[PDB]
Amino acid sequence: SMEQVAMELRLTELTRLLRSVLDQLQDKDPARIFAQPVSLKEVPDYLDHIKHPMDFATMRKRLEAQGYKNLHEFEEDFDLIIDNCMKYNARDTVFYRAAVRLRDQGGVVLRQARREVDSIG
C-alpha cells in the first residue's frame, strides 16, 4: 500500500535523525570506553552483574536494521550503556567517570532530538 510506503519513509527519516544523534553522542566518548561490547573473554563474570549489556556498536547494528521505532527505544539503549557502567564500576574509576560525562553531555543532544522528532512528526 501507499500508507505502508509513507510509514516506511517516516521510519527511514527517523533512522536518519537517530544516526546523526548517535554520532553526536558517540563524540562525547573520545576515549571509546563505550564503543564495543564488554568482552566476556576479559570480564567472564559480566553477565552475572549486568543482565542487558549495551554499547554503541550494538546500537548501530539495530539502527541500521531500522530497529528503533521511536526515540524512546533509542534512549532506552543509550541509558543502558550509562547505567550498566555506573553499576559495574565504582565511583572512583575512569569508566564510571566517563559514563557520568557522557550522560551529562548527551542530555543536551537528546533534549533537542526530542524537539526535532515531535516537530518534524
Side-chain angles (χ1 to χ4, degrees), residues 1-2 4-6 8 11-15 17-40 42-60 62-68 70-110 112-119 121:
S1 74
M2 213 18 259
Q4 289 302 314
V5 170
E8 294 160 359
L11 179 57
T12 294
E13 283 306 290
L14 175 71
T15 304
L17 181 156
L18 298 181
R19 192 178 304 109
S20 169
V21 177
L22 186 63
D23 290 341
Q24 281 177 74
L25 293 174
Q26 190 154 27
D27 294 328
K28 307 314 178 155
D29 173 31
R32 299 194 69 86
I33 291 164
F34 305 105
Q36 290 294 331
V38 168
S39 172
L40 306 172
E42 304 169 358
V43 189
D45 75 349
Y46 188 65
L47 298 184
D48 293 347
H49 293 268
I50 298 302
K51 300 296 168 182
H52 296 105
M54 194 46 56
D55 67 272
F56 283 131
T58 304
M59 294 190 55
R60 200 172 292 280
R62 185 162 165 194
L63 180 62
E64 289 314 334
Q66 295 187 345
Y68 292 113
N70 54 56
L71 186 52
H72 179 79
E73 293 186 343
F74 177 97
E75 293 173 308
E76 288 199 332
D77 272 355
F78 176 68
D79 288 334
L80 278 177
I81 292 178
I82 297 314
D83 291 338
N84 288 345
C85 185
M86 292 174 74
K87 294 170 185 73
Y88 191 80
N89 304 106
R91 214 160 29 251
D92 75 327
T93 60
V94 61
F95 305 107
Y96 185 111
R97 292 163 172 283
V100 166
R101 292 164 59 84
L102 177 63
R103 192 196 58 187
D104 286 350
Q105 296 193 274
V108 184
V109 171
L110 288 172
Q112 202 53 40
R114 163 55 64 207
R115 292 191 68 84
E116 283 174 347
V117 166
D118 291 4
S119 189

